[PDB]
Design a protein around this ligand. Structure first.
Ligand code: HEM
Ligand code: VNT
Length: 448
């Protein structure tokens, strides 16, 4: 009656999923062009997915309440990692309380200490691995390693870090990441079947929870004497009290730690990696010299004020990396009730989606979208959705960018880099969180 245009189904069981796999951006643009409409419906394994692909209409996706546009069903596949009743799996008011508590642990007030702590970890890394006059590295692997160290330095007590060090924490997160199946969104039977991948999620989460409980017990054994107990993400969340007067359970605390550490790890690593890749490319020398000018007068020891107040260009670099190659390609909700978007009604039962990948390549909002240009601004309000928006906007943005900017400032003060390829790497769309193709990320570092 008032449905968006349906892109024709020509291969029935998997309507558009194979073409989407082959070229996510190419596919979606072709739907947009052929149907002459930013708002269109594709068919994924038999499920209607209505894409809100017109930037002018972003608010119709991001602003409706959970009860109308629901995130629970689309995050169901992450329950084995977050836990039953945690985050999106909890009743919505309780979901928001949990997410709010997490947000409060990532506030700007803590950054006074985070900045030197982060730089210290970075400098430790570089000293140990970038210690030659010049050397070849995988930049993606190395940025990932730095982000695990910097994040854990900020958010984990030293006792926790001893128990769960960078190597072990990486392995744990990797076991989780490699064992999740986003396809379960469209093949919900997967969540009910015996799968090795589900078992592995349970093992990893159980290992983490065991470690947390041992740390909690040890702190309680030792605290009365200390006069100075450990303050970290774990202790913060443990002291949270819900509006009904009850504390978070360890189960919930573990899940929220999984959520934070998982969320921050890949996105922040990938963002740092893309930024450095672009900045070291010849097409972008004007931009590199803009970064080197920004940071030229900084102390050897970055402080809060340097990073928070005096790095607007470095931040523009991070943001435009996410603009061009957003780590999260597709944001989704389940439609619980009919919703107006543009000239259309999206029916109850649809999955509705808003794709940072598609929207970031709308040529009205972002002319020449495959050009990386940190000096661009959007020409359509709210077109940039790299960190989402509205009800579920990213709560980790500032902390993520804090780490990115600190690495950029620290790396480029002491090194140049040469990309060992003519072009900036292709994005690799095969993974949950999309980064540059790992095998294309070998670079030469050169000490200054
Ligand atoms: C570093 C680059 C980052 C990018 C590009 C990014 C991107 C996003 C996006 C697109 C969303 C929206 C999800 C949706 O609409 O369904 C989101 C939400 C979220 N992000 Fe991030 N994020 C980043 C860093 C972080 C970090 C460092 C953390 C935690 C330390 C974090 C934690 C979260 C959480 C908890 C949510 C859910 C918010 C809610 O549901 O209300 N993110 N992020
Ligand atoms: O990593 C995921 N979610 C993360 C996103 N994140 C927020 N900041 C940093 N990352 C996440 C979100 C909320 C919370 Cl609290 C914890 C996490 Cl850790 C995630 C990745 C991919 C998908 C996904 N599901 N379906 C797709 C998809 C569907 C069609 C085409 C392409 C992708 O992608 C879902 C979740």
């Amino acid at each position: 009656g008032k449905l968006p245009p349906v892109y024709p189904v020509t291969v029935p069981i998997l309507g558009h999923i194979i073409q989407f796999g082959k070229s996510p951006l190419g596919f979606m643009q072709e739907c947009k062009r052929q149907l002459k409409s930013g708002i269109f419906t594709i068919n994924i394994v038999g499920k209607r997915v209505t894409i809100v692909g017109d930037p002018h209409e972003h608010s119709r996706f991001f602003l409706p309440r959970n009860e109308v546009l629901s995130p629970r069903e689309v995050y169901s596949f992450m329950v084995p990692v977050f836990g039953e009743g945690v985050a999106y799996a909890a009743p919505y008011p309780r979901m928001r309380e949990q997410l709010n508590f997490l947000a409060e642990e990532l506030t700007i007030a803590k950054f006074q200490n985070f900045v030197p702590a982060i730089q210290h970890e970075v400098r430790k890394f570089m000293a140990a691995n970038w210690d030659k006059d010049e050397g070849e590295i995988n930049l993606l692997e190395d940025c990932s390693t730095m982000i695990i160290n910097t994040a854990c330095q900020c958010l984990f007590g030293e006792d926790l870090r001893k128990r769960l060090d960078a190597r072990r924490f990486a392995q744990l997160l990797a076991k989780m990441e490699s064992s999740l199946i986003p396809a379960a969104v469209f093949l919900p039977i997967l969540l009910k079947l015996p799968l090795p991948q589900s078992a592995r999620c349970h093992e990893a989460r159980t290992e983490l929870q065991k470690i947390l409980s041992e740390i909690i017990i040890a702190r309680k054994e030792e605290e009365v004497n200390k006069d100075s107990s450990t303050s970290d993400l774990l202790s913060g969340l443990l002291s949270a009290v819900y509006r009904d007067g009850t504390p978070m359970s360890l189960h919930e605390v573990c899940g929220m730690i999984v959520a934070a550490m998982f969320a921050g790890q890949h996105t922040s690593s990938i963002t740092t990696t893309w930024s450095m890749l672009h900045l070291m490319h010849p097409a972008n020398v004007k931009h590199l010299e803009a970064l080197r000018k920004e940071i030229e007068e900084f102390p050897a020891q970055l402080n809060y004020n340097n990073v928070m107040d005096e790095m607007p260009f470095a931040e523009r670099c991070a943001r435009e990396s996410i603009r061009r190659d957003p780590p999260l390609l597709m944001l989704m909700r389940k439609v619980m009730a009919d919703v107006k978007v543009g000239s259309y009604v999206v029916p109850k039962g649809d999955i509705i989606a808003c794709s940072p990948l598609l929207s970031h390549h709308d040529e009205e909002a972002f002319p020449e979208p495959r050009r990386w240009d940190p000096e661009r601004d959007e020409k359509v309000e709210g077109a940039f959705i790299g960190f989402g928006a509205g009800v579920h906007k990213c709560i980790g943005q500032k902390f993520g960018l804090l780490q990115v900017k600190t690495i950029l400032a620290t790396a480029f003060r002491s090194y140049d880099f040469q990309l060992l390829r003519d072009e900036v790497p292709d994005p690799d769309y095969h993974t949950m969180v999309v980064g540059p193709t790992a095998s294309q990320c070998r670079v030469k570092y050169i000490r200054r």
